[PDB]
Amino acid sequence: ATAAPQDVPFEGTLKIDVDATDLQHRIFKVKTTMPATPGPMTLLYPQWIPGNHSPTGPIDKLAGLVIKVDGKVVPWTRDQFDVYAFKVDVPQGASELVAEFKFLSPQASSQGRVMMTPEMLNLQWNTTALYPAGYFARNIKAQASVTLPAGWSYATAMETERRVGDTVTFKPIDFDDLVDSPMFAGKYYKRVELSAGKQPVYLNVFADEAKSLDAKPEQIKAHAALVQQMDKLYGARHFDHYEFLLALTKKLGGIGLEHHRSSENSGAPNYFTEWDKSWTGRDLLAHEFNHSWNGKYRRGADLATPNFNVPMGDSLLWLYEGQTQFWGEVMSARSGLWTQEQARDMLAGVAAQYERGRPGMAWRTVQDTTNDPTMSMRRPKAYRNYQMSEDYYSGGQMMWLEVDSKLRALTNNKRSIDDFGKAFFGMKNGDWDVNPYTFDDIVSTLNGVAAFDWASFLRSRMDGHGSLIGGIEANGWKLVYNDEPNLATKTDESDDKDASLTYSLGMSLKASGDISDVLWDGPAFNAGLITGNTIVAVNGRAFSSDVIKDAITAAKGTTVPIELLVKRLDRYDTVRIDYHGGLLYPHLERIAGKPDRLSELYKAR
Amino acid sequence: DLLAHEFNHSWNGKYRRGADLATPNFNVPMGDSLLWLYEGQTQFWGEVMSARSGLWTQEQARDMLAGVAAQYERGRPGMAWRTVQDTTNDPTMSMRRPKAYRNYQMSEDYYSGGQMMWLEVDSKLRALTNNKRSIDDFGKAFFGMKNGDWDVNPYTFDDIVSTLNGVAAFDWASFLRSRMDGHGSLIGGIEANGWKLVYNDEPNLATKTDESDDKDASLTYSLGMSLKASGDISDVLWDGPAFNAGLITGNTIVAVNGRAFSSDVIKDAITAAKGTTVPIELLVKRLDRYDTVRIDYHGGLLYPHLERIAGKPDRLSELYKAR
Ligand SMILES: CC(C)C[C@H](NC(=O)[C@@H](O)[C@H](N)Cc1ccccc1)C(=O)O
Ligand SMILES: [Zn+2]
Ligand SMILES: [Zn+2]
């Protein structure tokens, strides 16, 4: 019901002034000022947010909305068929419209991710913005300011005009870049140089406590190496400068969100201080950084929408996210954020997920999972393994691994997926506007690296129900299962003594015995068990992770079922599970006769 | 009954005291042999006087007495080997430290077992005298001398006998010894004074009040155990059904016929098992292990009450009546 945005000039400047001082209530106070055009005027609250691929704009957290034209309140009417659109009537001869409101950010995780704490805050300008309908967002010149808690430091890719006391005024910027230029602020801050030169890269760290900022030299070097390895892959940087934003916290809501010249990232307080325990999540900065090339600069044409209030088409997210998931893990190994053994066991877990952990592939394609952002909005799902769940990430990753192996085979290892990366994202160094692409562009660039029917290859994997893990064998390794723990599973389990048993009993458990996941058609599923039931005892003994694992091993090769005493709501029963395969965890093993292209792929350049 | 109990001791215990208990200083041992008078008859008068004074209703006092009677009819299997007299040694033996089986080791039964004997003494005094004398006459004769005197006036066993004989001639020495040195019934005073101990599924008023608010489950006369609302067993009756399933205090009843434990859940299952041949299935936690036991108990919920014997004179109500 809101008129379509037009690629026409916007006269004047959209001023967005935010007071971010009410940490106790977690309220962002907002004033938006813009020229007022006589007649009906519709203002938009951003709905579809770039990088979320879904209508995540928190419309019901916009409160206290009062709109004044030249100082006189004008009543507003919401469009009942577009609840993000507010309509007012501007009198003839008017000059200026001011909208004031408050963004009531989450006071608990049940409302969304927390954005204010006693020590830090995360300002996402889309949550504090109203903008006129009828214009391509990039045509609206904007200028933002923020009043910070007293004395706090801040970081953002957006250039500062002046700080007066605790009020930071930024230089004017196009409105789409404003939304794409989030800010972290906090009292415990460290700025770390990752790459000097004409297109510099910095790491901005905020923490709950100052002791978490003590990054050691080798740990900083791994982040600096990430930047160096991206240069080798792409040969260009799509920014004039880049600002990593990293929150080390137990209070701010978790985040990984890419932008052209920055990314919003969260880690635990021990990101640096316990480097060897916090490794499984360290592909995060590599992942989001890669999006500066793959997602921000190059974007699918159906995803690159003209404003924030028309729907996004996610059809090509298996490139956007899929190949970024691939490069995040590859680049973690190439830079030293991960060890080679860590990256290899992680890849083994991905391969196992599609060989045995995704029975839903029998009926649903990876391509259809590009609709999961809008279908589910990351709300809880009963069977991620059977409904599927954004597999354009990891399923896409496996496809790109096979693409790499095929490029090598076609060219006697003279070309690889690195050549696609440079060809598709390496043009136009320094540009950070949007360069759209279609499916045919992907095929054409791949064909330019090595001639082959890439259109049929891509569609057969993304529209099919068959194996996605062919890149493992083609690049010289084989997926196996044994009772040796997977490094990723072990690290993810060991803090609370949880039990991941996907490939043995077909479920995962918390240390409490509560079932946290059940594999469709697996042994636990076939006993009627669901997530939320509790394993009370194993063969009569009070549950623990060691107890149930010992029982699985004890049942290997026998005919005596494992007796699980189960609590289902307010009832207790004993189920007999005839599982005798023992503990099974995925790993990769070399195929001795074939060249090891996998290790070449994961090797630093 | 607390203030009635301790007040009665001003007469029975402080003023009149057994000679072996009335020691010359605080640092030579006390002889407790006569505590079934000191505490036993005071336990008796504490409850009687609660009814006479209105601290308790008559219905409350009657259900309390029913619980005492049931305790010695069915709740004290230890009487098969231990006498009430020997429990006067429990203060020094145990110092009220925790014991596994109050019902089998016995536990200061000179209180409530003594109370039951004194009820029977009352009934016998009435029977010997065509209801012209009662235990009230022993109270006045034994403790009613020397108004205003609060020095200690010691007594021996023979003094108890002679004063009882003065109320109504009878071989009181053999009577007292037969009850305090015996292993047989102590509840004869109930029927002699016109009532009968019965059990049914109607809650005992004392048990109900003691159960309430915390949602506990006293099941002594059905499953032979008591439980907290959590399912933790708080008591087990020797040779009862729970005992015969190997259960001990501290074990936990996790489920009843598969349903998560509650006091209502286990009570409903007991009622559902009344008159059938389907055992009650209890899921039990014993330390860190779980097992299911089958209890073949089909008597239903059983709580003690007193009921009139219609043909007999109601002396019990006279005893509990305000004077
Ligand atoms: C902490 C990490 C798990 C974060 C990780 N982030 C990403 O993949 C980003 O590149 C995504 N662009 C973040 C995203 C995608 C879809 C809907 C909402 C948010 C994610 O999976 O959300
Ligand atoms: Zn991503
Ligand atoms: Zn007393």
Name which residue sits closest to atom 22 of ligand 1, judged by CA: A256
Residue A510's contacts (CB-CB under 8 Å, 6 or more residues apart) are A496, A498, A516
CA of A238 to the centre of ligand 2 (A): 17
Q: Phi, psi (5° rounding) for residue A51?
A: 90, -15
Q: By the 8 A CB rule, do A585 and A484 touch?
A: yes
Q: Are residues B216 and B227 in contact, defined by beta-carbon separation less than 8 angstroms? A: yes
Q: Does residue A538 belong to the interface with chain B, where contact is any CB pair within 8 Å? A: no
Which residues in chain A are contacts of B258 at CB distance < 8 A? 571-573
Show residues of chain B in contact with A537, CB under 8 Å. 289-290
CB–CB contact B288 A536 (8 Å): no
Q: Is A541 on the interface with B (CB under 8 A)?
A: yes
CB atoms within 10 A of CB A560: 11
Ligand 1 atom with the smallest distance to the CA of A291 is 10
Would an 8 Å CB–CB cutoff place B288 in contact with chain A? yes
Count Cβ neighbours within 10 Å for each residue of B275-292 and write b for 16 or more, e otherwise.
eeeeebbbbbbeeeebbb
Give the strand order in the sheet containing A77-79: A77-79, A82-90, A39-44, A131-132
Q: Which residue of A has its CA nearest to B282?
A: A572
CA B69 – ligand 2 centroid, Å: 77
Question: A176: Cβ below 6 Å to ligand 1?
Answer: no
Q: How far is A497 from chain B (nearest CA, A)?
A: 18
The DSSP secondary structure of B8-57, one letter per residue, reads HHHHBTTTEEETTTS-SSTTSPPP-TTHHHHTHHHHHHHHHHHHHHTSS-
Asked if residues A70 and A96 have their Cβ atoms less than 8 Å apart, the reply is yes
The span from the CA of B295 to the CA of A402, in Å, is 64
DSSP annotation string for A205-224: EEESSGGGG---HHHHHHHH
> A563: closest CA among A589, A543, A581, A537?
A537
Please, which residues bridge with residue A242 across strands?
A201
Q: Is the CB of A257 under 6 A from ligand 1?
A: yes
From the list A540, A570, A573, which residue is nearest B289 (CB)? A540
Shortest distance between the Cα of B283 and any Cα of chain A, in A, equals 8
- Interchain CB contact of B283 with A (< 8 Å): yes
A270 in ligand 1 pocket by Cβ < 6 Å?
Answer: no
Ligand 1: distance of its center to the CA of B286 in Å? 47
Task: Give dist(CA A320, CA A299) in Å, integer.
Answer: 7
Structure tokens at A529: 């068990």
B259:A542 CB<8 A: no
* Residue B120 in marked binding region: no
Residues 452-481 on A with a CB inside 8 Å of B are: none
At what resolution in Å was this solved?
A: 1.9
By DSSP bridging, strand A242-248 and strand A201-207 are parallel
Is the CB of residue A225 less than 8 Å from the CB of residue A335? Answer: yes
Chain B interface, mutation test: which of A572, A573, A574, A575, most B Cβ atoms within 10 Å?
Answer: A572
By what method was this entry solved? X-ray
Residues from chain B contacting residue A572 (CB–CB below 8 Å): 254-255, 258-260, 283
Give A510→chain B minimum CA distance, Å: 18
Contact B243, B224 (CB under 8 A): yes
- Alpha-carbon distance of B89 to B93, in angstroms, equals 6
* CA–CA dist A177, A431 (Å, integer): 13
Between A394-410 and A340-355, two packed helices, what is the crossing angle to 10 degrees? 110
Based on C-alpha coordinates, what's the Rg of chain A? 26
Q: Which two tokens stand for residue B133?
A: 């004398």
Instruction: Give yes or no for A540 touching B (CB within 8 A).
Output: yes
- Spell out which residues of chain A touch residue B254, defining contact as CB-CB under 8 Å: 536, 572
Q: Whose CA is nearest to atom 13 of ligand 1?
A: A257
| Chain B residues within an 8 Å CB radius of A573 | 258
B6 C-alpha vs ligand 3 centroid, how far in Å?
Answer: 6
Query: What is the distance in angstroms between the Cα of A209 and the nearest Cα belonging to chain B?
Result: 41
Q: Among A530, A539, A541, A525, which Cα is nearest to A567's? A: A530
* Contact call for B259 and A565, based on CB within 8 A: no
Closest by CA position to A440, among listed A297, A320, A292, A300: A300
Q: What are the distances in angstroms from CA B312 to CA B70, B121, B195, B196?
A: 21, 18, 8, 11
Partners of B197 in beta bridges? B306
Among A537, A542, A571, the residue with its CB nearest the CB of B258 is: A571
Max intra-chain CA distance, chain A: 88
Sequence-distant (6+) residues with CB within 8 A of B204 are: B63, B66, B67, B303, B304, B305
Give the β-pairing of A183-186 and A120-123: antiparallel
A23 vs A251: CA distance, rounded Å: 12
Distance CA A266, CA A117 (A): 14
Q: Closest ligand 1 atom to the C-alpha of A287?
A: 10
Q: How far is the CA of A425 from the centre of ligand 1 (A)?
A: 21
B49: number of Cβ within 10 Å: 21
Measured CA distances, B37 to A398, A515, A597, B3, B139 (Å): 90, 62, 98, 18, 11
Binding residues of A for Zn(2+): 287-288, 291, 321
Contacts with A536 from chain B: Cβ below 8 Å: 254, 290
DSSP B214-250: TT-EEETTTTSEEE-TTSBEEEE-TTSHHHHTT--BT
Please report which residue ranges of A384-435 form alpha helices under DSSP H.
384-387, 394-410, 417-425
Asked if B302 reaches chain A (Cβ–Cβ under 8 Å), the answer is no
The Cα of B16 is separated from the nearest Cα of chain A by a number of Å equal to 58
Contact A356, A348 (CB under 8 A): no
Q: Inspect the interface and report whether the beta carbons of A572 and B289 lie closer than 8 Å.
A: no
Cβ proximity of A102 and A60 under 8 Å: no
Cβ of B258 and A537 within 8 Å?
A: no
Query: What does residue A348 show for φ and ψ, rounded to 5 degrees?
Result: -60, -40
Q: How far is CA A64 from the centre of its chain?
A: 31
Whole-angstrom distance, CA of residue A365 vs CA of residue A392: 9
Positive or negative torsion for Cα B246, B223, B190, B18: positive
Q: Which two tokens stand for residue B259?
A: 């349903």
Helix (H, G, I), strand (E, B) or coil at A102: strand
Q: Which string of DSSP letters, residue by residue, matches A130-189?
A: -EETTB-GGGSEEEEEEEPSTT-EEE-SSPEEEEETTEEEEPPEEHHHHHT--EEEESSE
The atom number, within ligand 1, closest to the CA of A258 reads 10
Best probe residue, ligand 1, of A53, A245, A255, A393 (max atoms within 8 Å of C-beta): A53
- Cβ of A540 within 8 Å of Cβ of B259? The answer is no
Contact A208, A269 (CB under 8 A): yes
- A546 touching B, CB under 8 A? no
Which residue's alpha carbon is nearest to atom 2 within ligand 1?
A: A256
| Ligand nearest to the Cα of B41, by number | 3
Question: Which of B259, B288, B290 lies closest to A571 in CB terms?
Answer: B259
Instruction: Provide the 8-state DSSP code for B162.
Output: H
Q: Name the minimum distance, in Å, from the CA of A575 to any CA of chain B.
A: 13
Q: At a CB cut-off of 8 Å and minimum separation 6, what does A519 contact?
A: A357, A359, A385, A502, A506, A507, A525
Opening angle at CA B208, ends B203 and B212, nearest 5: 145
CB A515 within 8 A of CB A498: no
Length of chain A, in residues = 605
In the reported structure, the alpha carbon of residue A177 is separated from the centroid of ligand 2 by a whole-number distance in angstroms of 19
- C-alpha A151/C-alpha B322 separation (Å) is 81
Residues in B closer than 8 angstroms to A540, CB to CB, are 289-291
**Cα A604 to Cα A232: distance, rounded to the nearest angstrom:** 9
